[PDB]
Design a binder for these strands. Structure first.
Ligand SMILES: [K+]
Ligand SMILES: [Mg+2]
Ligand SMILES: [Mg+2]
Ligand SMILES: [Mg+2]
Ligand SMILES: [Mg+2]
Ligand SMILES: [Mg+2]
Ligand SMILES: [Mg+2]
Ligand SMILES: [Mg+2]
Ligand SMILES: [Mg+2]
Ligand SMILES: [Mg+2]
Ligand SMILES: [Mg+2]
Ligand SMILES: [Mg+2]
Ligand SMILES: [Mg+2]
Lengths: 136, 172, 191, 197
RNA sequence: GGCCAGCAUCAGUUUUGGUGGCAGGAUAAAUCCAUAGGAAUGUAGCUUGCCUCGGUAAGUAUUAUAGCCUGUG
RNA sequence: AGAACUGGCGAUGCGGGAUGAACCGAACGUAGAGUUAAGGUGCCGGAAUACACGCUCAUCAGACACCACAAAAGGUGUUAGUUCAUCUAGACAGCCGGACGGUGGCCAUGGAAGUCGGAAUCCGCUAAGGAGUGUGUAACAACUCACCGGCCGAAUGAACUA
RNA sequence: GCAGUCAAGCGUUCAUAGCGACAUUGCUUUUUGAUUCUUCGAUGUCGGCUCUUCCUAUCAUACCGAAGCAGAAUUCGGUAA
RNA sequence: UUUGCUCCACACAAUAUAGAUGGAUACGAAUAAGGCGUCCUUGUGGCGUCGCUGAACCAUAGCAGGCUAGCAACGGUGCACUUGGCGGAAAGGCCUUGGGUGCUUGCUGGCGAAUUGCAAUGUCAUUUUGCGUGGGGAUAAAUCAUUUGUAUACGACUUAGA
């Protein structure tokens, strides 16, 4: 009896939006949108990760679902204070996205002996899982 | 011409026995290097005063850095440019963090919209608009509204591989 | 000029329920149900308070923001069609030959039959689109009324009836015979 | 990386897809293109129909059986776009073209194989939103291709069978996801997670 | 002795990386810190009207229960 | 078709301009390696479906000098500007109301009353109304518009530039 | 040879239904010129007959828009070879 | 048919390879939206979650992978059978029943490897063909010549003839 309209909630370019830099000197660090310059440009600040305050093209970053309360134009000290208060780093570390990034880094860091151990443990887990699947 | 820097260039109109210590004229020149900065300085000095490079000298060239390179500003830019059939003065507004970035955007925009090459453009003035509601161009005024948020629909992620196995999505 | 955001409002009266999947709009009201596919416009619908649907274009150009108001008008027309309905009144105009207009059946398709237009022996047959009701108006001479939920359907049926009665090989400023839309309003009055 | 790569041509920007496939062929990769009737061309349908009619009016004046052949089927339109970009008059180009197969729909050999896409050729990723585009099947039908209806019917039947197969696969995948949902707190699972698996 | 190679240490030519120490500038500008002065896309507070939980709207209010700008050091 | 200076072709291969005596680059013993020129880097085709800011949708789009053509004039197509204006004391558009009196102002005209024309461009009452913006009459009449009002409520209009 | 742009005028009134001066911008190579690059150890040199195809700047036929289109007839124009 | 033809199995010979060296790993649709899971009043529904690439998933240890002893569990996997179903777009493949049998690296052992000498693709695949040895199966036509004229320059075509 009520209207139904699909939302399609996008991540929004906004002050306090957390972004992940994918290419550049940062290339994998988190920053916060400090202000919006243009449809394609924002001023960001990533002081916790070591990202310098900079005007960056939105094509160089990917918006994360994380937002925190930050006033428009806040300087580096204020950005750091509000970032630490909102615990953005922990909220990102809890996400599957950062967990997937860490998993890819760990797999890339595996040695040959560790890959052999991975195969052995995968065979053990596969034996157990196949037995459970056949019992089910 | 390239990624721009701003230089102060001060020149002299070399002293004689009758006129020692001439009037030491100064300009703010946007150029990619000091050779081009000095060339542009002499070009405009020849447009303004009775002097040339042979009859003058460069007393000082100093790069001027942005005072607050990490503060978002609205710039008003007065330019003069030659079209295919005349000369015109235009006023434009650019949102950026530095004069050099605003000037680079201005040159790109003039080339894109009026086919105005670098040689055809004179930068009359670049000044920060201190107070909003003195911003007179809607394409900049729309970025000054309180709590401005906008999405980025239809995200196109670049593939590192020729073939994809997933029929990707443009959500964001 | 690439406006950052442009939005329009679609007021939803009480007895109307609007279901908006991706861009397939379904409007349900007292008079029936209408459906429209707007997947060619790239707009965004959002329900605000169950009586208001906002439709928005982000980073849109001039033509895009024009099509946004077009979308708003189309959805408003769907709501008006399911609440008030749409009725087009046409009057047959003729100088000498009376235009005979009737509803006939051919394989159960309910054509509008036009005979004796300008004395012609040819019989004009205009199919009635589904959902359009044809009534011949009493107390008004030579008047046909086309009614329905879809304003597009009723207006296209009226247009077809008008076009089938175009005069050929004559000065149309003199030979004004035809069936012309005389009124475009709603079915329910004064609402 | 596969002996044969099967590209699902639906919505794939025929020229860019042809560039990708031509480079793969010349580099020695076997390519099979399916659903060629669902390919796209940028530009309005009327624009591309006029372009095809301009192609159609070109023929050897003294004998039309000698002139350029105007193949109407979508797979052959794609093949023409690809042959114009492969050096088809050399032995190397002939071998590269022999490494290629193009089909309308997904014929029985490939209806049970993995279909890939080419993002650099995908219409949704390449074309600016709101730009108009043409569908190869519609263009081919307008210029004389005779089998749009048959291909559509066989595609509907194949999609029914594939939907049944995918329902079975999804049920089995749910069973497997349950099986590895448990045995995830076991010591082997914790060691695998510590090693990144 | 002949043919084809592999490795190591060199020499000439060259290509592509990692990394260390210095010099200059507005002895970079910034950030940061301290201080002074401000307005606003006006934070807290306060006043007024409304209303579905509870905030909005309009004023005042220059840091407060956010901050920002400019100058100086 | 004929002169001046220089550089070239003739007499000259090579890389580029698809192709070409003259253009661009560079001039040549036989080879190896490296770097480039002009030109290029979706595929043919060696080389980024590179990065960045914008502009363009063409039912004959456009796509690198020599060179293989296009002009005047136009377009609420779209983009960016210049100048002058109107506007909360209410702008533009839109809908509705008024649109008068001296007065058929003076004159040929057969007739001419705002509206075939010549000159004259006034006054009154006005919130406002031209000695009339058009339709219309033989002339009237009757409609219509400038101009002012009622409704709405925030931006709008014009002439130009490329 | 063909086609535009302006618009003083023609068209009883009225520039643009149809026209259109004074000017001015073009297109074409079915005119005739200009040139002498190819052919003078040789491209058979008019016209007609026959036959095929192509172009459109369309005479007719199809469908239309406009008129100083009442009808009829006609004129201007569009898609069209 | 101077023992012909075809198919299968094996062995031996040739013959080449547009180019194997773990696996082409199957929804459809949309992209200003979807996938998956779950719940209900089964919908254009609610809730949760995911993407930000396949950098994945599966597989993967053993003289190119030998010979044996056990433990644990009725799992995984190959082989040849076998029950049945589905698939005609080019189906020539997919699924499935039962038992047999080999391996199992899921876990714990014992034995072997060497001298290819410090590397040399260090030969591991499939494409056709021939031949020999066994088994299974079948036992024709076409053309020339003659003839016809529904045909025809000649070929060809169309007919007839134990
Ligand atoms: K001759
Ligand atoms: Mg007539
Ligand atoms: Mg045919
Ligand atoms: Mg060396
Ligand atoms: Mg000579
Ligand atoms: Mg030379
Ligand atoms: Mg060329
Ligand atoms: Mg290449
Ligand atoms: Mg022009
Ligand atoms: Mg009159
Ligand atoms: Mg001869
Ligand atoms: Mg001859
Ligand atoms: Mg024509």
């Amino acid at each position: 009896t009520d209207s139904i309209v699909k939302a399609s909630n996008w991540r929004l370019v906004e002050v306090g939006r957390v972004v992940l830099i994918k290419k550049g000197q940062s290339a994998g660090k988190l920053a916060a949108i400090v202000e919006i310059i243009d449809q394609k440009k924002v001023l960001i600040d990533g002081p916790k990760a070591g990202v310098p305050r900079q005007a960056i093209n939105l094509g160089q970053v990917v918006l994360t679902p994380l937002t925190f309360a930050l006033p428009r134009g806040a300087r580096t000290a204020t950005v750091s204070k509000k970032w630490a208060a909102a615990a953005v780093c922990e909220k990102w570390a809890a996400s599957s996205w950062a967990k997937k990034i860490a998993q890819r880094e760990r797999r890339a860091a595996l040695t040959d002996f560790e890959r052999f151990q991975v195969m052995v443990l995968r065979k053990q887990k596969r034996y157990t899982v196949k037995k459970a699947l056949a019992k089910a | 011409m390239a990624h721009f820097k701003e230089y102060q260039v001060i020149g002299r109109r070399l002293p004689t026995e009758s006129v020692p210590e001439p009037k030491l004229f100064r300009m703010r020149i946007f150029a990619s290097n000091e050779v081009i900065a000095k060339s542009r300085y002499w070009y405009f000095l020849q447009k303004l005063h009775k002097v040339k490079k042979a009859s003058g000298e460069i007393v000082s060239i100093n790069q001027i850095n942005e005072a607050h390179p990490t503060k978002v500003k609205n710039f008003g830019v007065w330019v003069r440019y030659d079209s295919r059939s005349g000369t015109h003065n235009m006023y434009k507004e650019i949102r950026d963090v530095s004069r050099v970035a605003a000037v680079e955007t201005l040159y790109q925009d003039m080339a894109a919209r009026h086919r105005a090459r670098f040689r055809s453009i004179h930068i009359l003035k670049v000044a920060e608009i201190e107070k909003t509601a003195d911003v007179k161009r809607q394409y900049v005024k729309q970025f000054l509204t309180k709590d401005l948020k906008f999405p980025l629909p239809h995200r196109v992620q670049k593939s590192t591989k020729t073939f994809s196995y997933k029929r990707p999505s443009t959500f964001y | 000029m690439k406006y950052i955001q442009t939005e329009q409002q679609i007021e939803v009266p009480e007895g109307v329920t609007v279901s908006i999947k991706s861009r397939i709009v379904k409007v349900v009201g007292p008079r029936g149900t209408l459906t429209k596919n707007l997947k060619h416009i790239d707009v965004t619908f959002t329900k605000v308070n169950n009586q208001l649907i906002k439709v928005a274009v982000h980073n849109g150009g001039r033509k895009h923001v024009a099509a946004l108001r077009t979308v708003k008008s189309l959805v408003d027309n769907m709501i008006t069609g399911v609440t008030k309905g749409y009725k087009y009144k046409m009057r047959y105009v003729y100088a000498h030959f009376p235009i005979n207009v009737n509803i006939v059946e051919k394989d159960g398709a309910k054509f509008i039959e036009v005979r004796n237009f300008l004395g012609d022996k040819k019989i004009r047959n205009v199919p009635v689109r589904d959902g359009v009701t044809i009534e011949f108006s009493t107390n008004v001479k030579d008047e046909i009324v086309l009614s329905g939920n879809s304003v597009e359907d009723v207006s296209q049926n009226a247009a077809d009836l008008q076009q089938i009665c175009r005069v050929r090989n004559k000065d149309i400023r003199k030979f004004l015979d035809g069936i012309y839309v005389s009124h475009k309003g709603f079915i329910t009055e004064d609402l | 990386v596969e002996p044969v790569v099967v590209i699902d041509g639906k919505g794939h920007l025929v020229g860019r897809l042809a560039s990708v496939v031509a480079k793969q062929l010349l580099n020695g990769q076997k390519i099979v293109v399916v659903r060629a009737e669902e390919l796209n061309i940028s530009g309005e349908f009327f624009r591309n129909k006029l372009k095809y009619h301009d192609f159609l009016r070109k023929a050897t004046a003294f004998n039309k059986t000698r002139g350029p052949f105007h193949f109407r089927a979508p797979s052959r339109i794609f093949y023409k776009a690809l042959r114009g970009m492969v050096s088809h008059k050399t032995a190397r180009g002939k071998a590269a073209l022999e490494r290629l197969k193009v089909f309308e729909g997904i014929p029985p050999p490939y209806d049970k194989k993995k279909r890939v896409v080419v993002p650099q050729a995908l219409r949704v990723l390449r074309l600016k939103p709101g730009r108009k585009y043409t569908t190869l099947g519609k263009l081919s039908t307008s210029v004389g291709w005779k089998y749009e209806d048959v291909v559509a019917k066989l595609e509907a039947k194949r999609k029914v069978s594939s939907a049944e197969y995918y329902a079975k696969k999804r049920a089995f995948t749910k069973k497997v996801a349950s099986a590895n949902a448990t045995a995830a707190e076991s010591d082997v699972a914790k060691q695998l997670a510590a090693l990144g698996y």
